[PDB]
Amino acid sequence: AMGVLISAVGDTDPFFHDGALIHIARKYRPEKVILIFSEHTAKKQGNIEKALFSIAPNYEPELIIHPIISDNEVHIFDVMFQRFSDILQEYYTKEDEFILNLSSATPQIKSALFVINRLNGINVKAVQVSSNIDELIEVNKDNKVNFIDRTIEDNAEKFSQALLKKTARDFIEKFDYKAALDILDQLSDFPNLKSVREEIRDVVNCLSKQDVPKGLRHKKLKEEEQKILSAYLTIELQRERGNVSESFIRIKNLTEFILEDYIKKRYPGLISLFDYSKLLKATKEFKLKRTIAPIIDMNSSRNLSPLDSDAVKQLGIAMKTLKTLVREQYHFSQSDFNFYQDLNKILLTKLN
Amino acid sequence: MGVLISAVGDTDPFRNFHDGALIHIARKYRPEKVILIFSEHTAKKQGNIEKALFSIAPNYEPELIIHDPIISDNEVHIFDVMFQRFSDILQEYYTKEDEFILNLSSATPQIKSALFVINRLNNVKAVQVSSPDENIDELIEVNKDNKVNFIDRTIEDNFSQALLKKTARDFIEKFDYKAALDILDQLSDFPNLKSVREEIRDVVNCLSKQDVPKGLRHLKEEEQKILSAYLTIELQRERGNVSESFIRIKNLTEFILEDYIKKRYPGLIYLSLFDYSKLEFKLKRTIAPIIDMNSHSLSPLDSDAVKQLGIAMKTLKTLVREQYHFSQSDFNFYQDLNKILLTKLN
């Protein structure tokens, strides 16, 4: 990797103490002295060099002269950004660092450098500087090894990630872990990366597989619990999203899973929903038939290739009878019915 | 409402022959809310700026907002300081309903920079006006651009939205309509925007309730369905919802194997797939894999089952095309819609 200072050369460069460029270049000690001079920054072409080189021998750089800058369009706003946005675009800096040495030059440039660096969503440093050719280049106030380095970098989020974060966040809170996941995998290194990713990752993987997610692998009463929880929220979570045709499947599963669970106990089996429906009466069932009814009104009603509109309610009304249904047959908890709410709350706040 | 948050700089109106940034910019884009945050120096020309503004032309005098806090002359040349000072100013009136211009010309250059910084970083726009006390009427009357016909050198340049766009692209390119939708939903107005959304929405809506997308509605009535369901199943596999495939495939075969014996011999004898498997010695060798997926209890799918979710897809795929001639002109619908969509977004 090498360091390229994609920095211009205004009135300040190169000159008791040196100029932002001199300092900028001198302090960061790079391997690419990118210089995009302008109409006035012609003159300084001559000495600017003599400065950069003559600072210290046996420390030789790349001094690449930039399309001269536009003696008129060097105080033009959007132009400044357009030129520079290109200038940055030129040397993409795949595996090197850009020294956006935007401390010196014409206002527009300075502003523009910043907006570039600050915008520029990747590893590229934006920088500032706080305030006889060979003659001056001898008595330079920072012409030694151990000098007061006034160079101080920006150290921002890049703001690229900002949108990324926000935009990925809104999905996690939107209940869309798949969305969130992808968002996140784009996101460049960040502490709470692992915890966001790893978390999202475990949630993702688990859901698809049809296992308990190995996060909500809580101390439940065997598979029947974990799975019974895992499903119970697979449908809930699901219903949260969109898949209003997922419900039917999930429910009709559980509607059975538990249906067979209770039947397995009361009147030990001793052998569809109509198998439930019939079994309900004769086999120590009465109150369960009321419960299991609407549940079994949806599954039969659901059944062509059309989709009713009262079903959009029947789904809802199905859920309460499926939530309520499970609470009875198994005594879970609202503390353990927040699995993902927690996940989201730990998650969201881990994002922040 | 169009409300420009303009600085109150020294070269205000009375800035030579032509009109002066503030008043200049203001006229050009005729705003309804002439937002002005005036600092210590510019505090003098507080009244004048009112005269010129209003005296620019009648039947177009907006309610101007004198900035709530006086600007301090310690933040004149103030670099980042003004950036903050700006940062808050913008935040004060988010007015996502309305739109804003950040007058490039304003006053101290730092405040300028900030005004830019504010605008670049992130609904409201801004453009400066390229170059050429107590005058009052003297200034206004003999104004060099003080007449309806004037040269509009106030020309502004034209990021986050772009980034969001691409962000939302990939989702469409991943075949995630909900995603794409979302990132669109928030997105602002654009030329393709309507269509990119409109279709997206119709496809989500179309996929939502058991019906067939507007586009996909081009075959007979049912054939639309028999097929318009399939691509459902195909879209499924795309985004790893393996769980959905089984019941789609299942519903698929039988919706067809039945709608195939409807005419090839009405028969009576829910009609389970086990029933169809009995009722065509040749057919009963092609729909074997679909009957292989017949045989869970809250349990998961072993590594192998994900294969079955595939051989069956080849079972149902070839099953679709065989019994109904459709052609790869159909089962590219979404392959195209991607390309239409993506082309569109461009």
Side-chain angles (χ1 to χ4, degrees), chain B residues 240-241:
Chain B
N241 292 31

mmCIF file with all atom_site columns, all heavy atoms in Angstrom, chain B residues 239-254, unseen atoms left out:
data_model
loop_
_atom_site.group_PDB
_atom_site.id
_atom_site.type_symbol
_atom_site.label_atom_id
_atom_site.label_alt_id
_atom_site.label_comp_id
_atom_site.label_asym_id
_atom_site.label_entity_id
_atom_site.label_seq_id
_atom_site.pdbx_PDB_ins_code
_atom_site.Cartn_x
_atom_site.Cartn_y
_atom_site.Cartn_z
_atom_site.occupancy
_atom_site.B_iso_or_equiv
_atom_site.pdbx_formal_charge
_atom_site.auth_seq_id
_atom_site.auth_comp_id
_atom_site.auth_asym_id
_atom_site.auth_atom_id
_atom_site.pdbx_PDB_model_num
ATOM 1  N N   . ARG B 1 239 ? -34.646 -16.412 -3.203  1.00 0.00 ? 239 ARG B N   1
ATOM 2  C CA  . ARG B 1 239 ? -34.307 -15.617 -2.035  1.00 0.00 ? 239 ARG B CA  1
ATOM 3  C C   . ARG B 1 239 ? -34.365 -16.499 -0.790  1.00 0.00 ? 239 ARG B C   1
ATOM 4  O O   . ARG B 1 239 ? -34.532 -16.002 0.321   1.00 0.00 ? 239 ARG B O   1
ATOM 5  N N   . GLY B 1 240 ? -34.172 -17.807 -0.990  1.00 0.00 ? 240 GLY B N   1
ATOM 6  C CA  . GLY B 1 240 ? -34.011 -18.742 0.111   1.00 0.00 ? 240 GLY B CA  1
ATOM 7  C C   . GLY B 1 240 ? -35.161 -18.643 1.108   1.00 0.00 ? 240 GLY B C   1
ATOM 8  O O   . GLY B 1 240 ? -34.957 -18.278 2.264   1.00 0.00 ? 240 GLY B O   1
ATOM 9  N N   . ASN B 1 241 ? -36.370 -18.975 0.643   1.00 0.00 ? 241 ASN B N   1
ATOM 10 C CA  . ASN B 1 241 ? -37.508 -19.172 1.524   1.00 0.00 ? 241 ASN B CA  1
ATOM 11 C C   . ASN B 1 241 ? -37.993 -20.613 1.399   1.00 0.00 ? 241 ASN B C   1
ATOM 12 O O   . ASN B 1 241 ? -39.196 -20.869 1.391   1.00 0.00 ? 241 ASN B O   1
ATOM 13 C CB  . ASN B 1 241 ? -38.636 -18.184 1.218   1.00 0.00 ? 241 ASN B CB  1
ATOM 14 C CG  . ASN B 1 241 ? -38.278 -16.754 1.561   1.00 0.00 ? 241 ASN B CG  1
ATOM 15 O OD1 . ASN B 1 241 ? -37.115 -16.364 1.479   1.00 0.00 ? 241 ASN B OD1 1
ATOM 16 N ND2 . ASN B 1 241 ? -39.279 -15.944 1.863   1.00 0.00 ? 241 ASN B ND2 1
ATOM 17 N N   . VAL B 1 242 ? -37.042 -21.552 1.401   1.00 0.00 ? 242 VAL B N   1
ATOM 18 C CA  . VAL B 1 242 ? -37.271 -22.888 0.878   1.00 0.00 ? 242 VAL B CA  1
ATOM 19 C C   . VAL B 1 242 ? -38.625 -23.387 1.376   1.00 0.00 ? 242 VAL B C   1
ATOM 20 O O   . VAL B 1 242 ? -39.244 -24.245 0.751   1.00 0.00 ? 242 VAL B O   1
ATOM 21 N N   . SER B 1 243 ? -39.052 -22.865 2.531   1.00 0.00 ? 243 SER B N   1
ATOM 22 C CA  . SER B 1 243 ? -40.202 -23.398 3.241   1.00 0.00 ? 243 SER B CA  1
ATOM 23 C C   . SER B 1 243 ? -41.461 -23.223 2.395   1.00 0.00 ? 243 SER B C   1
ATOM 24 O O   . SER B 1 243 ? -42.428 -23.963 2.553   1.00 0.00 ? 243 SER B O   1
ATOM 25 N N   . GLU B 1 244 ? -41.436 -22.218 1.512   1.00 0.00 ? 244 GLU B N   1
ATOM 26 C CA  . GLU B 1 244 ? -42.625 -21.796 0.792   1.00 0.00 ? 244 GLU B CA  1
ATOM 27 C C   . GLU B 1 244 ? -42.831 -22.703 -0.418  1.00 0.00 ? 244 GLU B C   1
ATOM 28 O O   . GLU B 1 244 ? -43.953 -22.867 -0.893  1.00 0.00 ? 244 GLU B O   1
ATOM 29 N N   . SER B 1 245 ? -41.732 -23.292 -0.901  1.00 0.00 ? 245 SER B N   1
ATOM 30 C CA  . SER B 1 245 ? -41.727 -23.993 -2.173  1.00 0.00 ? 245 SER B CA  1
ATOM 31 C C   . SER B 1 245 ? -42.639 -25.214 -2.097  1.00 0.00 ? 245 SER B C   1
ATOM 32 O O   . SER B 1 245 ? -43.391 -25.493 -3.028  1.00 0.00 ? 245 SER B O   1
ATOM 33 N N   . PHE B 1 246 ? -42.535 -25.952 -0.986  1.00 0.00 ? 246 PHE B N   1
ATOM 34 C CA  . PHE B 1 246 ? -43.145 -27.266 -0.871  1.00 0.00 ? 246 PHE B CA  1
ATOM 35 C C   . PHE B 1 246 ? -44.639 -27.160 -1.162  1.00 0.00 ? 246 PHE B C   1
ATOM 36 O O   . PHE B 1 246 ? -45.198 -27.988 -1.878  1.00 0.00 ? 246 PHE B O   1
ATOM 37 N N   . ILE B 1 247 ? -45.280 -26.145 -0.572  1.00 0.00 ? 247 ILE B N   1
ATOM 38 C CA  . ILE B 1 247 ? -46.727 -26.025 -0.601  1.00 0.00 ? 247 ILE B CA  1
ATOM 39 C C   . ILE B 1 247 ? -47.141 -25.392 -1.926  1.00 0.00 ? 247 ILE B C   1
ATOM 40 O O   . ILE B 1 247 ? -48.252 -25.612 -2.405  1.00 0.00 ? 247 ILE B O   1
ATOM 41 N N   . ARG B 1 248 ? -46.247 -24.571 -2.486  1.00 0.00 ? 248 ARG B N   1
ATOM 42 C CA  . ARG B 1 248 ? -46.449 -23.990 -3.802  1.00 0.00 ? 248 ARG B CA  1
ATOM 43 C C   . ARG B 1 248 ? -46.378 -25.092 -4.855  1.00 0.00 ? 248 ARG B C   1
ATOM 44 O O   . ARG B 1 248 ? -47.335 -25.316 -5.592  1.00 0.00 ? 248 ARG B O   1
ATOM 45 N N   . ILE B 1 249 ? -45.246 -25.806 -4.879  1.00 0.00 ? 249 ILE B N   1
ATOM 46 C CA  . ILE B 1 249 ? -45.067 -26.942 -5.766  1.00 0.00 ? 249 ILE B CA  1
ATOM 47 C C   . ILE B 1 249 ? -46.267 -27.873 -5.624  1.00 0.00 ? 249 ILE B C   1
ATOM 48 O O   . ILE B 1 249 ? -46.912 -28.220 -6.611  1.00 0.00 ? 249 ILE B O   1
ATOM 49 N N   . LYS B 1 250 ? -46.555 -28.269 -4.379  1.00 0.00 ? 250 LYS B N   1
ATOM 50 C CA  . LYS B 1 250 ? -47.618 -29.220 -4.098  1.00 0.00 ? 250 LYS B CA  1
ATOM 51 C C   . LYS B 1 250 ? -48.920 -28.714 -4.712  1.00 0.00 ? 250 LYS B C   1
ATOM 52 O O   . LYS B 1 250 ? -49.533 -29.396 -5.530  1.00 0.00 ? 250 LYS B O   1
ATOM 53 N N   . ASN B 1 251 ? -49.302 -27.488 -4.340  1.00 0.00 ? 251 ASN B N   1
ATOM 54 C CA  . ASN B 1 251 ? -50.505 -26.863 -4.865  1.00 0.00 ? 251 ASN B CA  1
ATOM 55 C C   . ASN B 1 251 ? -50.425 -26.817 -6.388  1.00 0.00 ? 251 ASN B C   1
ATOM 56 O O   . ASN B 1 251 ? -51.442 -26.918 -7.071  1.00 0.00 ? 251 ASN B O   1
ATOM 57 N N   . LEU B 1 252 ? -49.197 -26.700 -6.905  1.00 0.00 ? 252 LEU B N   1
ATOM 58 C CA  . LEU B 1 252 ? -48.974 -26.521 -8.330  1.00 0.00 ? 252 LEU B CA  1
ATOM 59 C C   . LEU B 1 252 ? -49.362 -27.800 -9.066  1.00 0.00 ? 252 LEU B C   1
ATOM 60 O O   . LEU B 1 252 ? -50.385 -27.845 -9.745  1.00 0.00 ? 252 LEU B O   1
ATOM 61 N N   . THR B 1 253 ? -48.542 -28.842 -8.897  1.00 0.00 ? 253 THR B N   1
ATOM 62 C CA  . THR B 1 253 ? -48.763 -30.114 -9.563  1.00 0.00 ? 253 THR B CA  1
ATOM 63 C C   . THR B 1 253 ? -50.260 -30.411 -9.603  1.00 0.00 ? 253 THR B C   1
ATOM 64 O O   . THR B 1 253 ? -50.840 -30.550 -10.677 1.00 0.00 ? 253 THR B O   1
ATOM 65 N N   . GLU B 1 254 ? -50.889 -30.388 -8.424  1.00 0.00 ? 254 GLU B N   1
ATOM 66 C CA  . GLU B 1 254 ? -52.218 -30.947 -8.246  1.00 0.00 ? 254 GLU B CA  1
ATOM 67 C C   . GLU B 1 254 ? -53.245 -30.020 -8.891  1.00 0.00 ? 254 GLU B C   1
ATOM 68 O O   . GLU B 1 254 ? -54.296 -30.469 -9.344  1.00 0.00 ? 254 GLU B O   1
#
